[PDB]
Structure formats: C-alpha cells, structure tokens
Amino acid sequence: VPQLKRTTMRILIGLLVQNPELATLVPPLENLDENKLPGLGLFRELVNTCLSQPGLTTGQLLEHYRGTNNAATLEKLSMWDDIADKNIAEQTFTDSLNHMFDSLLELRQEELIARERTHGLSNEERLELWTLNQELAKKDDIPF
C-alpha cells in the first residue's frame, strides 16, 4: 500500500475502483471538459466501464485498464485509503463529488477573470462572475 497525498480525484477514483457499485451514484459527466480538471477523464471512463459491466468486481474493473498507461495509478489507488465501511465509502464519495463540482465552479470563475483581464466581460458573463463570487465565498507520480 503506497502512501499518497489526498486529492479529490484520488479519493473518487480510489473509492470507485474499490467499490464499483458507486458508479451508479455519479450523474452524467459526458459534457464536462476533461482538459480542465486532471483525473476527470479517467474517472468518467471508470464510471462508464462499471455501468457497462454490471456485477463486476474490483479485479475485473482493473483488468480492463491493466495494459493502459493508467494501470500503475489504478493499481496504487486500488490499495490506498481503503474504506471497508460502505456507509463511510458512500458518504465520502458523495462529499467528494460535490467538491469536484465546486472545483469546476472555481475553474470557471478563473476563466471569466482571465477573459475580463484580456478583453472585458459581456453582461451575461458579469452576472455569472458575480454569482460565482458569491457562491464561492459562501463555500508519487499520479497526475491528479
């Protein structure tokens, strides 16, 4: 078992590999841009494998990826932060899903600030940035 720093995507991917039934808790991710958030593309792939192979075990899930360039990462995460308590696994998974979407909100806020600095914002973007600012105020070679 490796010692890895926690990140949101490490928690989500580790818990999903260890408990493939958590895939059915994940809302549709098809339209999200994997390029903005390291680990999101792999997480979405794993969800899709689970939903495509109901009944699968952790070992069966990992088998699909063992010849890919993510095999080492997934093997490490399959053994890391193991939570044998399904109550805690589900609650931690749901909490981290919410944190992932919070991070996408912060990434969008940063995108709007970049546009603002380079050529200004439209009325619609100004409303979005205002709501994001209020909402966010209220709130080892693995590459994510």
Curated annotation (Swiss-Prot):
Quote the protein name from its UniProt record: DNA primase
The set of disulfide-linked cysteines is none
The written remark on domains in the entry is:
Contains an N-terminal zinc-binding domain, a central core domain that contains the primase activity, and a C-terminal DnaB-binding domain.
Record family assignment: Belongs to the DnaG primase family.
Subunit structure, per the record?
Monomer. Interacts with DnaB. The primase-helicase complex is composed of up to three DnaG bound to one DnaB hexamer. Component of the replication restart primosome, which is composed of PriA, PriB, PriC, DnaB, DnaC, DnaG and DnaT.
Describe the function of this protein: RNA polymerase that catalyzes the synthesis of short RNA molecules used as primers for DNA polymerase during DNA replication.
